[PDB]
Amino acid sequence: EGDVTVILNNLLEGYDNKLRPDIGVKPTLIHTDMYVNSIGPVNAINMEYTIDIFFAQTWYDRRLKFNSTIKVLRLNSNMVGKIWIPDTFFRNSKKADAHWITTPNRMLRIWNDGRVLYTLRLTIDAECQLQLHNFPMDEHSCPLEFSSYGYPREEIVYQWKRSSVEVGDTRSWRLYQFSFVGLRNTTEVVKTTSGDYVVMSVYFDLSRRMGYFTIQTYIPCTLIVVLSWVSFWINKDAVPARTSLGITTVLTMTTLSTIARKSLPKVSYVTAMDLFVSVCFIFVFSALVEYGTLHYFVSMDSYARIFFPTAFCLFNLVYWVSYL
Amino acid sequence: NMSLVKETVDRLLKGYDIRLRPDFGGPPVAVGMNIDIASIDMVSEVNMDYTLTMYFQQAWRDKRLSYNVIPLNLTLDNRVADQLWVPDTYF
Numbered sequence: 420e421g422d423v424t425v426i427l428n429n430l431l432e433g434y435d436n437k438l439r440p441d442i443g444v445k446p447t448l449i450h451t452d453m454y455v456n457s458i459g460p461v462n463a464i465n466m467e468y469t470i471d472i473f474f475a476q477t478w479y480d481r482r483l484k485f486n487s488t489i490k491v492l493r494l495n496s497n498m499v500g501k502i503w504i505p506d507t508f509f510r511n512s513k514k515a516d517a518h519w520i521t522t523p524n525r526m527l528r529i530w531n532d533g534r535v536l537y538t539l540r541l542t543i544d545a546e547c548q549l550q551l552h553n554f555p556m557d558e559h560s561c562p563l564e565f566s567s568y569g570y571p572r573e574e575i576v577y578q579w580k581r582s583s584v585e586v587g588d589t590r591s592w593r594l595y596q597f598s599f600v601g602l603r604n605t606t607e608v609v610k611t612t613s614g615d616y617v618v619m620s621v622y623f624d625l626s627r628r629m630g631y632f633t634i635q636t637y638i639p640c641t642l643i644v645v646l647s648w649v650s651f652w653i654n655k656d657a658v659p660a661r662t663s664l665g666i667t668t669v670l671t672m673t674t675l676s677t678i679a680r681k682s683l684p685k686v687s688y689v690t691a692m693d694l695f696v697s698v699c700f701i702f703v704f705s706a707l708v709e710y711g712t713l714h715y716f717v718s719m720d721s722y723a724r725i726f727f728p729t730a731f732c733l734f735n736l737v738y739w740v741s742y743l
Numbered sequence: 744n745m746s747l748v749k750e751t752v753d754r755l756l757k758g759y760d761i762r763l764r765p766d767f768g769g770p771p772v773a774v775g776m777n778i779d780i781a782s783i784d785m786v787s788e789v790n791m792d793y794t795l796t797m798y799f800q801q802a803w804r805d806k807r808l809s810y811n812v813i814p815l816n817l818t819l820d821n822r823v824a825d826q827l828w829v830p831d832t833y834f
């Protein structure tokens with residue numbers, strides 16, 4: 420007994436949690452908010468990103484109305500299973516789960532006018548359709564779409580608060596090669612087989628940082644094709660030396676083509692990194708066939724001694740400006 | 744109108760036998776099926792499988808769950824699926 424016990428036992432008598440508030444009157448207006456904690460790693464081979472949020476929803480329920488000196492009933496997650504909660508699901512989430520240690524991480528606060536606030540902690544692997552062209556210099560806008568599952572537009576209308584989306588410090592975020600540029604929230608009505616649903620989207624603008632691949636595949640390949648260009652300084656009578664240099668350069672260019680493809684997923688189109696790999700491979704192959712042609716002629720070295728460094732130097736001005 | 748919907752739902756769920764199918768001793772119930780393919784994730788050759796996400800949807804007729812006063816379709820909560828008969832569809 421007491422004050423809050425009789426209030427809760429009077430609210431929950433004659434209550435059906437199956438029926439939404441104003442089931443045959445008007446659509447239920449739900450004000451959502453969110454507070455991102457740490458956007459996790461953006462996985463490119465599997466095409467999703469991880470996000471940890473404090474998803475909070477607010478609506479009105481006229482059955483949860485009490486008149487007393489108590490203004491707010493601050494309750495734990497035990498009262499979630501007794502009242503009505505909208506069936507908000509994330510439309511592009513591959514897998515998600517709430518947190519259940521040491522207690523279900525849910526909050527429930529009921530005001531005296533019927534206003535209900537319901538906050539829970541979620542970890543969501545949401546699908547982002549990252550286009551890997553331009554990679555490793557890509558830029559993406561990752562969405563987070565949520566809507567009610569069963570209730571159409573005529574029954575639940577979601578709405579955004581002005582300062583609903585709250586990000587964190589943006590440094591505890593495990594985004595390594597990317598960097599959150601900003602956020603934008605939108606709302607729209609989708610049409611499905613069951614009916615029309617209000618869909619709320621949050622777009623996360625992420626721009627990449629290539630510092631990682633520079634040491635992965637760029638510098639490494641550039642230094643191999645620099646080692647391709649020293650063959651011209653070796654004398655033409657040293658045939659096994661220069662052909663050993665040639666075969667080692669081409670086999671390791673194939674090896675570095677294979678290794679750098681392991682980071683990329685199995686897509687059909689070509690990327691700028693693959694274009695750079697192909698340009699380096701045809702440069703070293705041109706160097707080997709130029710040395711071969713010189714060997715068959717003696718049985719132009721200086722001519723290449725300037726042309727082959729310069730052709731890559733004009734290429735890098737072409738490649739980096741056009742992709743940046 | 745909330746009290747009318749309340750007493751109608753309480754009338755529908757009272758005496759409802761979960762173990763018997765619609766027309767249990769009568770004719771086979773016709774179950775119409777709609778599928779909305781959301782995504783296909785991993786067409787894997789090493790495990791010989793594909794991962795498929797879909798909005799699986801079934802539709803049949805239960806004559807016990809019929810009401811006449813209310814003229815709009817009732818979208819109930821998802822927790823009444825443990826109280827209503829559903830088909831035993833598997834893959």
Ligand SMILES: *[C@@H]1O[C@H](CO)[C@@H](O[C@@H]2O[C@H](CO)[C@@H](O[C@@H]3O[C@H](CO[C@H]4O[C@H](CO[C@H]5O[C@H](CO)[C@@H](O)[C@H](O)[C@@H]5O)[C@@H](O)[C@H](O[C@H]5O[C@H](CO)[C@@H](O)[C@H](O)[C@@H]5O)[C@@H]4O)[C@@H](O)[C@H](O[C@H]4O[C@H](CO)[C@@H](O)[C@H](O)[C@@H]4O[C@H]4O[C@H](CO)[C@@H](O)[C@H](O)[C@@H]4O)[C@@H]3O)[C@H](O)[C@H]2NC(C)=O)[C@H](O)[C@H]1NC(C)=O
Pocket residue numbers: 496497498499500501515516517519523525
């Ligand atoms: C097919 O079979 C499977 C297996 O039987 C069915 O799945 C099961 O479904 C039931 C019913 O929903 C669940 O029971 C409920 O579980 C939650 C907690 O769920 C968390 O813990 C689960 C247990 O974890 C075990 O395994 C992990 C493995 O790592 C271990 O670490 C743990 O120690 C455990 O050994 C875990 O499985 C859950 O993860 C799964 O589900 C989540 C869903 O969000 C997914 O994301 C995950 O990917 C994964 O699939 C999850 O981590 C309990 O909280 C429930 O108890 C509350 O609710 C009851 C019903 O209302 C109530 O009676 C209880 O008193 C209790 O209520 C309290 O909490 C409520 C919370 O709001 C309050 O409202 C309430 O007032 C009160 O305070 C309940 O026990 C099974 O856990 C789940 N198990 C699995 C393996 O999935 C599946 O449904 C079947 N499918 C079909 C279509 O039939």
Ligand SMILES: *[C@@H]1O[C@H](CO)[C@@H](O[C@@H]2O[C@H](CO)[C@@H](O)[C@H](O)[C@H]2NC(C)=O)[C@H](O)[C@H]1NC(C)=O
Pocket residue numbers: 814815816
């Ligand atoms: C309840 O849902 C049914 C779904 O079939 C709706 O009935 C259909 O309405 C469309 C649009 O007018 C018609 O073209 C179909 O012929 C109807 N189908 C059937 C089988 O009758 C119905 O309108 C819905 N009711 C409400 C109140 O939304």
Ligand SMILES: *[C@@H]1O[C@H](CO)[C@@H](O)[C@H](O)[C@H]1NC(C)=O
Pocket residue numbers: 579580581582604605606
């Ligand atoms: C998104 O948030 C802003 C915050 O000011 C709000 O004005 C807007 O209505 C919300 N959604 C849209 C684009 O309708």
